[PDB]
Amino acid sequence: GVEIETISPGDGRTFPKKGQTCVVHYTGMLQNGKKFDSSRDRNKPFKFRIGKQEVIKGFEEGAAQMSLGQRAKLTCTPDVAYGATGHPGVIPPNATLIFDVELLNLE
């Protein structure tokens, strides 16, 4: 349920492995074009370990499919992103989220 449109190419050899923290700069957006989150806005890279169930799953598969240094557009369907309940106060119910994700570094 996650698609990858490559804005910028990556090395193509290095990918997120199990138990490895992936740092990314993401710019979350709704389909209508509005923005709800941006690690670039806070000027702090977002730091998460893949496969440890800490981020929305669709973002997780998108990052896993990404490669080092690659910049890609992650379209996350409502099932893989916040579901029918939606994130209260930010994400409306049954919302599809598109992210501009860049894999800054892999560790």
Binding site: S8, P9, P88
Partner: protein, 385 residues
């Protein structure tokens, strides 16, 4: 009248009721601000005593009964049909005056606003109707600011009705003020109402005005103005190239903007058409320009993903070649010598066309317009001047 008795036989003190309501509004008029302190305090004391006596005699319920009996009739025309012409014209004014009197009776007095607690639920039930929206909203504001028990009474459905008032009646800052009063009362905040107001108003992003921090975008164009017309000596095919010497993907928090392509002018005036001079708009953000960002064909501020071998956002050392056939309206692109699989076709040819590029910051590009000015990295398509 409700028992369908004859209107002439029934007596309705229409004029005297309005005159007395004006008298009561004057009698409960709040003291004027510029008055001296002592006189102001005396008049507040008198108003407080008046409200106390009226509430003890139970005038609030009488006013509520009159308001209910007037709301029995849906519209001014309906009241004019069930009653006399004079009642028809006075229905709106009397109903507004009653709400003004209710607000005057409850305003500033804590005990009256506390006794209004039972009637909060009934009052909000008529918030949607236009003839009483302003008066009901004012009464609600007074009760909320004065009585904490009103905040206890207000429920999720009442908050949703107040919010839907914004959706149906448009933007009104008084509804926002009422919602603010709901959140905090006398230095005490209610977590339930805060959460409900947030979770119901904010996520939609359709009622409150939205904000974003957007980069400025500027457009550079050559002096040429090429167009197509019958019996006019212009070569319908044209070709030019642009190379990105340097580009920064993120100079600011927002992504950099770099689009290349053709643009047209409404009429024969040299001003580019359909776009504002300054702002965040660039090539393709109107139906007068046509752009290529490296991944999307931009026209009318709508982007479509166009395929291309090793498609990427326009980066350093990228040579973009633009094509224009005015014989059959068609704009084609070709990045690094290989063609992208997208075309702008059957667009308007009334006006003149010219090359244009849009950039925001950190952009370093060079026009290659052919001949002495620029030397084409790639060979122009056959017959393209």
């Amino acid at each position: 009248l409700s028992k369908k008795a004859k209107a002439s036989t029934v007596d309705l003190p229409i004029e005297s009721v309005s005159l007395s309501l004006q008298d009561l509004i004057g009698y409960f008029h709040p003291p004027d601000e510029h008055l001296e302190h002592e006189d102001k305090q005396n008049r507040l004391r008198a108003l407080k005593n008046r409200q106390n006596l009226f509430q003890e005699e139970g005038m609030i319920n009488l006013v509520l009964e009159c308001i209910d009996r007037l709301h029995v009739y849906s519209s001014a025309a309906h009241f004019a049909d069930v009653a006399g012409r004079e009642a028809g014209e006075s229905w709106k004014s009397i109903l507004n005056s009653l709400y003004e009197l209710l607000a005057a009776l409850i305003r500033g007095n804590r005990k009256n606003c506390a006794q209004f607690s039972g009637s909060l639920d009934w009052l909000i039930s008529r918030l949607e109707r236009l003839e009483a929206s302003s008066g009901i909203l004012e009464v609600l504001h007074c009760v909320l600011v004065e009585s904490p028990e009103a905040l206890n009474i207000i429920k999720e459905g009442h908050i949703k009705s107040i919010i839907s008032l914004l959706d149906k009646h448009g933007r009104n800052h008084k509804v926002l003020d009422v919602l603010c009063s709901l959140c905090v009362c006398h230095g005490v905040a209610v977590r339930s109402n805060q959460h409900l107001i947030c979770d119901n108003l904010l996520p939609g992003r359709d009622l409150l005005l939205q904000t974003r921090l957007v980069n400025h975008v500027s457009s550079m164009r050559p002096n040429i103005f090429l167009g197509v017309s019958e019996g006019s000596a212009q070569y319908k095919k044209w070709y030019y190239e642009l190379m990105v010497d340097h580009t920064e993907p993120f100079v600011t928090a927002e992504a950099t903007h770099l689009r290349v392509g053709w643009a047209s002018t409404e009429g024969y005036s040299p001003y580019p058409g359909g776009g504002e001079e300054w702002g965040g708009n660039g090539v393709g953000d109107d139906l007068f320009s046509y752009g290529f960002d490296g991944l999307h064909l931009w026209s009318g501020c709508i982007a479509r993903t166009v395929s291309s071998p090793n498609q990427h956002l326009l980066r350093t050392d990228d040579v973009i070649s633009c094509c224009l056939d005015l014989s059959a309206p068609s704009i084609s692109f070709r990045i690094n010598g290989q063609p992208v699989q997208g075309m702008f076709e059957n667009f308007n040819i009334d006006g003149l066309f010219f090359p244009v590029v849009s950039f925001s910051a950190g952009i370093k590009v060079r026009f290659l317009l052919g001949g002495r000015h620029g030397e084409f990295k790639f060979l122009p398509p056959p017959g393209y001047a």
